[model samples]
Target: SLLELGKMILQETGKNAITSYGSYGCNCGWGHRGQPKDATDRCCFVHKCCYKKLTDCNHKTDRYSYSWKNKAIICEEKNPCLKEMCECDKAVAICLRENLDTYNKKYKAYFKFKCKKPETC
Candidate 1:
């Protein structure tokens, strides 16, 4: 599960819960599924929960898409309550950046594991 707030809201809207591509509730995209893989993925999952709590906001991927430059200047909200989304995405961006190396190692191992899945796969 996610945060207490996200848990409460996820209970209400099954739509958001469907976005849990990763088994651990991380990975926002449909194609990427399974465990956290690394700490960055966990950060992504947290961001998902953060967004799930704020039902009014849209386009929460702003910071995720931004370069590692003056993101503070670019993370402005276009509408009300979107400011919260900016904050949430900011955390995800920084979190993933700090643990950047873990991402590649994480997925590499997963793919290697996939290559060995000739038995059950």
Candidate 2:
């Protein structure tokens, strides 16, 4: 398991790395029905209300694609993918705030966006 642990260290160091290959959320490229293989796949963060991406910034039809914006608006309007997670923003924010002395700019305002529940999603 040394390889896995090393990957975790690399991730913690903020080096871009694919730490998980689970077929969850848009990682399977299931967002736009794109094939769920390779780095080209679409993905959501924490499977929560406020989502980020696995794909790098700027590309076609993937997470960074401009086309994804309009679709995300529509998809998120329904809150279909909203769910609580071990790493939800509120929880992460608390952790960061508690350890603010060691926190970086990335964790500075992470709790600003509290996840909201949908009417029926």
Candidate 3:
């Protein structure tokens, strides 16, 4: 899981070295669960959608979830691991990169690049 990647990053680069770049569009976002292969399962929100057109806040889930034992577990602290706020360390990045549409849509708003030395081979 990405959480494990986060620990790996924190181990090699230090926590501050791994911060994510985030973004939101006029009316667009990404999935809350599932995987890249399951794009249709993605809980996407678009500004052009009925919900965005009607409600002020389009993002649901209110909180983020992390996989514990194949089930998503919500963390007590704010999920900084989310690319909507951070790029994800590495494990999550694997999944996020799979969903390029989701990344491009959100990342286009906030671009982030790392200057730290590479950790994993």
Candidate 4:
């Protein structure tokens, strides 16, 4: 359903859509299919669409191969993990700057909720 909605929204807006492993404290490296359990280890933003690491950026138990901070996943364009979130021009720019102000301000301009996260989910 998310895949279908991502496609449909992309078609309607003529802008790219993405499903990212974005999280705060831990890397969203879902072993096989969905988000990893670490996703629950952090405090999500208001919409749960955003998050910030609750712990120090440590190197242990993290994908330190790329020099990323262990405290959190920096969803910025400069980070090697940029495309993992979304590779569009705007998303890239916003992430590069950690521009949450700009992102939340113009979020609706870029993406829409074709499917809502169900209460049970």
Candidate 5:
């Protein structure tokens, strides 16, 4: 519920760009089967979320980074994405935008802006 709630807010902000980069199809994280090869193959602790972006993975020290991903993962695990409206849409949008780069890098997803009228949510 909270995930969708937050996601909606992120989407409706009229600013955020939501893009899904499919799955972790390739080995680019912990427990994956592969060597550190290309960009996606270079896995880092990334606060435990596993990210390919060197900037994001090495931005901070361990003490704080770990917890951030843990918190986000817990939130996501508890509240998976769904198709619906939410009350805290703004809040979620703000949160996601605050760390848009990090989130995108971590999830291997991207968010782009759309100006066209919406046919559906």
Candidate 6:
């Protein structure tokens, strides 16, 4: 899902992009799974929720898109829109950094994390 999108943006980030296609669960790995598997997924989960707060873009329908025109712009180029988008990314970035232990543990095979979907989204 958004794992690819996250990879692309994590490499570099629309309002930003993450391949959160089917489910809003785990957009960091292979795709959205049943639920978040670790800290990485938690960050993505929060990242997804962060986007849902904004009204300028549709968090559900919008996704990673390949554009040949009008693709270069700053998150601040807009107003609160991209700013928050950047925040989501930044938040996840920070979240991952803070939970580096969990982040690494997740890839260790069968590692688990408990992150219930927040009701706000």
RMSD per model, one decimal: 12.4, 16.5, 13.7, 15.6, 16.1, 7.5
Question: What is the per-residue lDDT of model 2 for residues 32-77, given as tens digits with 9 covering 90 to 100?
Answer: 2222222222122222222343222211222210112322211121
Q: Which candidate model has the greater lDDT, 1 or 4? A: 1
Work out the TM-score per prediction: 0.49, 0.20, 0.20, 0.19, 0.22, 0.47
Residue pairs in clash, model 6? 1-19, 1-31, 2-18, 2-19, 2-20
Better of 3 and 6 by TM-score: 6
Ranking by TM-score: 1, 6, 5, 3, 2, 4
Best by TM-score: 1
Q: Put down candidate 5 lDDT per residue, 30-67, tens digits, no spaces.
A: 34332322232222222123222223222122111111
List the global CA lDDT of all models: 0.44, 0.25, 0.30, 0.27, 0.28, 0.47
Cα lDDT tens digits, model 1, 1-115, are 1232233223322223333322222253434444454576666566666765777646423322222244332344456456666666556555655654554433433334432
- For 54-78, candidate 4 gives per-residue lDDT tens digits of 1332212222221223633232434
Count of backbone collisions in candidate 6:
5
lDDT of 6 by residue, 2-119 (tens): 3333543543322133232122234553334335655656676677667667888543334433322253222332455645555565466556555545434343343344434444
Model 1: lowest-lDDT 10 consecutive positions: 112-121
Return model 5's CA RMSD, one decimal.
Answer: 16.1
Which ranges of candidate 3 are over 4 A from the true structure?
A: 1-22, 28-67, 71-98, 105-107, 110-121
Worst 10 residues of 5 by lDDT: 78-87
Candidate 3, residues 1-121: lDDT per residue as tens digits?
3344444334433332123312232112332211222221121221123232333221233333434334332233344433232222233333333444543323233233212231221
Model 6 segments more than 4 A misplaced:
1-25, 29-33, 58-78, 105-120
Give the clashing residue pairs of candidate 4, or none: 57-71, 58-71, 76-95, 77-96
